[PDB]
Amino acid sequence: GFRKMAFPSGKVEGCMVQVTCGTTTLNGLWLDDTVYCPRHVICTAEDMLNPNYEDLLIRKSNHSFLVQAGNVQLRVIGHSMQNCLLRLKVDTSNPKTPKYKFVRIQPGQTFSVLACYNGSPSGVYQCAMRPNHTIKGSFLNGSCGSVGFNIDYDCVSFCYMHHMELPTGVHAGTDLEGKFYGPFVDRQTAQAAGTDTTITLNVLAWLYAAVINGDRWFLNRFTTTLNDFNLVAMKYNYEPLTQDHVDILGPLSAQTGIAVLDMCAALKELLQNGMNGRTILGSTILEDEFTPFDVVRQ
Amino acid sequence: GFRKMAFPSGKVEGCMVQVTCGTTTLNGLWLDDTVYCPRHVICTAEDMLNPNYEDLLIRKSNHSFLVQAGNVQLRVIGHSMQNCLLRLKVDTSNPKTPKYKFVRIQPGQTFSVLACYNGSPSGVYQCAMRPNHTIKGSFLNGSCGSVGFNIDYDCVSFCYMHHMELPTGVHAGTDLEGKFYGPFVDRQTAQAAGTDTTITLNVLAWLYAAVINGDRWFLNRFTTTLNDFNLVAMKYNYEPLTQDHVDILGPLSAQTGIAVLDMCAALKELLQNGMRTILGSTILEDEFTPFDVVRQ
Numbered sequence: 001g002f003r004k005m006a007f008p009s010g011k012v013e014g015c016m017v018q019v020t021c022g023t024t025t026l027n028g029l030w031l032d033d034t035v036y037c038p039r040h041v042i043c044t045a046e047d048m049l050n051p052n053y054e055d056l057l058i059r060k061s062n063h064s065f066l067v068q069a070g071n072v073q074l075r076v077i078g079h080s081m082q083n084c085l086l087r088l089k090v091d092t093s094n095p096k097t098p099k100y101k102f103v104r105i106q107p108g109q110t111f112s113v114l115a116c117y118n119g120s121p122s123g124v125y126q127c128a129m130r131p132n133h134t135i136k137g138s139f140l141n142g143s144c145g146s147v148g149f150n151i152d153y154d155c156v157s158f159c160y161m162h163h164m165e166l167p168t169g170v171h172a173g174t175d176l177e178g179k180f181y182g183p184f185v186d187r188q189t190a191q192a193a194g195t196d197t198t199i200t201l202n203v204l205a206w207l208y209a210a211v212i213n214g215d216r217w218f219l220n221r222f223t224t225t226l227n228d229f230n231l232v233a234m235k236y237n238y239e240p241l242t243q244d245h246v247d248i249l250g251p252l253s254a255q256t257g258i259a260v261l262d263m264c265a266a267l268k269e270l271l272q273n274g275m276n277g278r279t280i281l282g283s284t285i286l287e288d289e290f291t292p293f294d295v296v297r298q
Numbered sequence: 299g300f301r302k303m304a305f306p307s308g309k310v311e312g313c314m315v316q317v318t319c320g321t322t323t324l325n326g327l328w329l330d331d332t333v334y335c336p337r338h339v340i341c342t343a344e345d346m347l348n349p350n351y352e353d354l355l356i357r358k359s360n361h362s363f364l365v366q367a368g369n370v371q372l373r374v375i376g377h378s379m380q381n382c383l384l385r386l387k388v389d390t391s392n393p394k395t396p397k398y399k400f401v402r403i404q405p406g407q408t409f410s411v412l413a414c415y416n417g418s419p420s421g422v423y424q425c426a427m428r429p430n431h432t433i434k435g436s437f438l439n440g441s442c443g444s445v446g447f448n449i450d451y452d453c454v455s456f457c458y459m460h461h462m463e464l465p466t467g468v469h470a471g472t473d474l475e476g477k478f479y480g481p482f483v484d485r486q487t488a489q490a491a492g493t494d495t496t497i498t499l500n501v502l503a504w505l506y507a508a509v510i511n512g513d514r515w516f517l518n519r520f521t522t523t524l525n526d527f528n529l530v531a532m533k534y535n536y537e538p539l540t541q542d543h544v545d546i547l548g549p550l551s552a553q554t555g556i557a558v559l560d561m562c563a564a565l566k567e568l569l570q571n572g573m574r575t576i577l578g579s580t581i582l583e584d585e586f587t588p589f590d591v592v593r594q
């Protein structure tokens with residue numbers, strides 16, 4: 001009844017191409033006359049903490065990159081490195097280029113991922129940027145260069161390009177300027193992310209979504225202080241709630257009729273006692289990948 | 299890393315339009331020179347208690363249906379009824395019509411929904427045809443005509459068109475021939491879905507997925523016949539397992555080394571004793587197919 005939804009992916013699907021350098025093939029994003037892809041496509045198996053990407057790329061030519069848009073092949077007439085991305089300039093300008101921008105999303109925010117393989121889209125799902133700057137996504141081999149995005153109006157805000165899977169199985173990538181999210185580097189060495197936490201602002205948004213959907217069982221008559229709640233949050237590996245967070249939830253406090261500090265009391269009770277086998281909005285776990293904005297849209 | 303994934307929606311977005319008739323607008327599906335939409339578009343709020351569609355349809359002309367594909371308007375050149383669907387022959391053939399079929403989805407199978415409002419795609423989600431022929435979808439006021447679909451290769455198998463919410467909160471609709479899923483009718487009436495049952499095939503697939511992910515407390519060394527398993531399942535309102543279901547679980551069984559009937563013996567104990575968490579939750583997921591699982 002209330003479920004994760006992904007943006008319609010059509011404006012992105014039209015931008016997906018396949019980029020091959022040597023014996024390596026991944027996905028790239030074709031916008032106007034530029035193709036973006038992860039730079040480790042030049043990289044053989046010297047990915048193993050060896051890569052000097054400046055050295056590997058100086059030895060390449062436009063000729064060494066093969067880019068296919070569906071059936072058609074596009075001629076690479078230029079190339080450059082932007083952080084951990086390749087910028088391939090091509091002769092044809094994507095007729096399907098949408099209105100778009102590049103944005104760097106902040107932890108806790110959500111976006112849709114179009115999981116791609118050899119340049120053909122295969123799946124779409126919603127997810128979130130974790131506090132430790134990883135995403136708990138679904139990426140197989142060949143998904144590299146898949147992009148994450150939000151759509152507002154006719155405009156596509158790209159926020160993520162996929163680069164690698166970490167040992168723990170979470171995923172790491174960059175924005176569309178090629179700067180990584182988090183402490184990661186694009187080399188096949190072992191890398192740990194920071195210890196993750198739970199997105200408090202999103203759980204509270206979700207609890208509001210349950211109230212707005214006719215699920216009030218977890219509420220109570222109590223209340224707590226911002227700091228008094230925050231003390232419970234730390235004991236449970238939850239992100240401290242900022243005063244601004246409260247201000248973000250204002251509109252939802254209104255429609256629900258529950259004061260933000262009251263919902264914290266409810267949440268504090270849920271964390272301490274558990275859920276006793278009941279469910280909220282259909283889930284038996286405190287759900288932290290809907291934003292206030294997401295809940296408003298449904 | 300197990301998430302519900304929807305198919306890419308773009309091959310379907312290219313086909314969504316806006317049908318208006320009177321003061322009622324909903325969504326329509328535009329393939330070639332025909333536009334498909336729910337026939338209840340021609341009803342008034344009054345004529346919703348016991349409508350005679352053939353009557354209401356005879357009392358309408360081409361010029362009675364407004365079909366808008368974005369800013370452009372399409373001209374209705376013809377119109378007929380196909381069961382619970384209106385077929386509007388249109389001015390133009392859709393330049394963006396993909397390779398497609400009309401398939402009839404079986405209970406337990408899944409599909410992607412493109413939730414549209416005013417012909418404008420809003421969002422994509424995945425869901426399953428429940429055994430009681432409803433779906434637990436996400437459809438607000440204005441979603442009728444939104445379409446459900448699967449993609450295999452470059453081809454869109456259309457399988458659902460949305461028509462109604464039932465008082466349960468769940469949703470009912472037709473295939474793209476206009477034949478409803480279930481016993482439901484496009485009249486405001488006292489219809490309601492039957493008792494739902496759990497899709498046992500998908501729960502068994504979920505258990506294989508959890509085993510693959512390192513969760514395996516629920517296994518046991520007991521065994522069960524198909525027949526003794528099916529008898530227990532039905533007492534708990536789980537679908538009985540068919541011969542074909544057992545085969546569809548073949549790949550997952552071998553990948554795990556857990557024989558199908560051994561996983562059934564584990565599910566049997568969970569049904570009779572309860573749970574403890576599986577893949578993070580205490581309720582068994584039943585909308586993840588065996589196919590969803592093998593993809594990872």
Ligand SMILES: O=c1cc(-c2ccccc2)oc2cc(O)c(O)c(O)c12
Pocket residue numbers: 025026027040047139140141142143144163164165186187188189
């Ligand atoms: O997960 C991936 C990781 C890497 C990689 C290479 C060097 C250092 C770190 C990661 O390359 C890839 C290339 C692909 O075509 C693909 O589908 C992938 O999933 C990966």
